[PDB]
Design a protein around this ligand. Structure first.
Ligand SMILES: [Ca+2]
Ligand SMILES: [Cl-]
Lengths: 32, 471
């Protein structure tokens, strides 16, 4: 999973943010 | 690589997020130079993907290295570098070199972007120039983080001689056009071994723009290291500076009451931060100001935000960067644009604030006033440190400047400012104008002592005075 503050975009690759964080975007954001 | 190459008597880099080249050129002459700023970090100037809705992040999906984006073409770019450099304000390029696009489409210059087949004709790049697909999903594995695709974006292979050549050419082209350095995007997702080679192939800065002979491009890298990962920020400080993410996180907490201000007495490497000369610090950046929490201070929480920025600019630690945002309610929302997708230029109001949807934090009196403070105290160290053993602190920078903060209770103390006798204008609430202080003023006695007053109910929780704002 992606640790806090790192790049995320679940709709692109399905990789989730590590709990308990969520992505600020579906395509290009950060886990916070 | 670690020298910002600022002109004499200047400090701070302002991120003019999504600003056009023509507007930055104007800003360099009319505001940045007069207020003593050192440089501007510009948004990616190379051709990138035209994404649906024109979000801010489309700029982080390169299609080629042609200098033509919503910010302008190469002519506008050169006009900007010529004018800014003449004004003594440096330009730092946001270099997106870890990847290309995450989907098919066209770039801002009309070039084709074929993510599916890994073809980018304008460069050109083909399948052999990328790492075999896989996705970044395990930060405890350095190889996964660096060699796989970051959120679906095709991952370039900087190990390839062809690719290195292309990247070196792009960066040297920027150097020829007068840039002073680079903000390296997603540095953590690239191998230091490849980066050292690339940065070593960069030519010295162009003397035609006012740089000294032998000047090397300033390199500052985005790593995002908060501990507990396979990759460390220390792996990148051998060839450049690293953007110290821990700085804003710790300051954001302290100034929001999560830590007593008196504890900032040993602020620096003891707190787990990089050695000062290797760090570029900031309170918030374009990425983290869009958060699902409130750990990061932004323009939407004015009071503590300005306090953190003031502390950053008063303290001698690192090279400082100031964020300059556009108003937003949604995280994917792009900058102000018209019906056709063209960027709307910031308008300058009579009170020096911006219109058309730009926050312009760099134009806030409390912010530029502190940039002036930093210039006035250049070369000094923290002295006369004081605290009420809680949330009220004060300290001077040599005998050139003094600053006081309160994040709890009213501050009313006769403190030793270390400053020469005289009447000083508080640069936070006002400034020296027409021979008088437009805001608060502080009278320093023959001994350097002075009555400092700062109510917890004032619009700001910081007071700052220095020798260049003296009556
Ligand atoms: Ca990579
Ligand atoms: Cl950054």
């Amino acid at each position: 999973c992606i640790p806090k503050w790192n790049r995320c975009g679940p709709k692109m690759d399905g990789v989730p943010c590590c709990e308990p964080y969520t992505c600020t975007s579906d395509y290009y954001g950060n886990c916070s | 690589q670690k020298d910002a190459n600022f002109a004499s008597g200047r400090n701070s880099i302002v991120h003019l997020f999504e600003w056009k080249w023509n507007d930055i050129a104007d800003e360099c002459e009319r505001f940045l130079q007069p207020q003593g700023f050192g440089g501007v970090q510009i948004s990616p100037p190379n051709e990138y993907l035209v994404a649906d809705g024109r979000p801010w992040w489309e700029r982080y999906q390169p299609v080629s290295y042609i200098i033509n984006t919503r910010s302008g073409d190469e002519s506008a770019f050169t006009d900007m570098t010529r004018r800014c450099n003449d004004a003594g304000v440096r330009i730092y390029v946001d270099a997106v070199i870890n990847h290309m696009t995450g989907m098919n489409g066209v770039g801002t210059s009309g070039s084709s972007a074929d993510h599916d087949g890994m073809n980018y004709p304008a460069v050109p790049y083909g399948s052999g120039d990328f790492h075999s697909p896989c996705e970044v999903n395990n930060y405890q594995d350095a190889d996964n983080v660096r060699n796989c695709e970051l959120v679906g974006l095709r991952d370039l292979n900087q190990g390839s001689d062809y690719v290195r050549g292309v990247l070196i050419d792009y960066m040297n082209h920027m150097i020829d056009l007068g840039v002073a350095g680079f903000r390296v995007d997603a540095a953590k997702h690239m191998s230091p071994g490849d980066l050292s080679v690339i940065f070593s192939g960069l030519k010295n800065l162009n003397t035609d723009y006012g740089f000294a002979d032998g000047a090397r491009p300033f390199i500052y890298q985005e790593v995002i290291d908060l501990g507990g990962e396979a990759i460390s920020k220390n792996e990148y400080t051998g060839f450049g500076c690293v953007l110290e993410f821990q700085f804003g996180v710790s300051l954001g907490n302290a100034f929001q009451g999560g830590n007593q201000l008196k504890n900032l007495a040993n602020w620096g490497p003891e707190w787990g931060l990089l050695e000062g000369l290797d760090a570029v610090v900031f309170v918030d950046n374009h990425d983290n100001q869009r958060t699902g929490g409130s750990q990061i201070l932004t323009y939407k929480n004015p009071k503590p935000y300005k306090m953190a920025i003031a502390f950053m600019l008063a303290h001698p630690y690192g090279t400082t960067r100031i964020m300059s945002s556009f108003d937003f309610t949604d995280n994917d929302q792009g900058p102000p644009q018209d019906g056709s997708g063209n960027l709307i230029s910031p308008g300058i109001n009579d009170d020096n604030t911006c219109s058309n949807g730009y926050v312009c934090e760099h134009r806030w009196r409390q912010v530029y006033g502190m940039v002036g403070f930093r210039n006035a105290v250049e070369g000094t160290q923290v002295e006369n440190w004081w605290s009420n053993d809680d949330n009220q602190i004060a300290f001077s920078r040599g005998s050139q400047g003094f600053v006081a903060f309160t994040n709890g209770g009213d501050l009313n103390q006769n403190l030793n400012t270390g400053l020469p006798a005289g009447t000083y204008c508080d640069v936070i609430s006002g400034e020296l104008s027409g021979g008088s202080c437009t805001g608060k003023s502080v009278t320093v006695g023959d001994n350097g002592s002075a009555d400092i007053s700062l109510g917890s109910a004032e619009d700001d929780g910081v007071l700052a005075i220095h020798v260049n704002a003296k009556l």
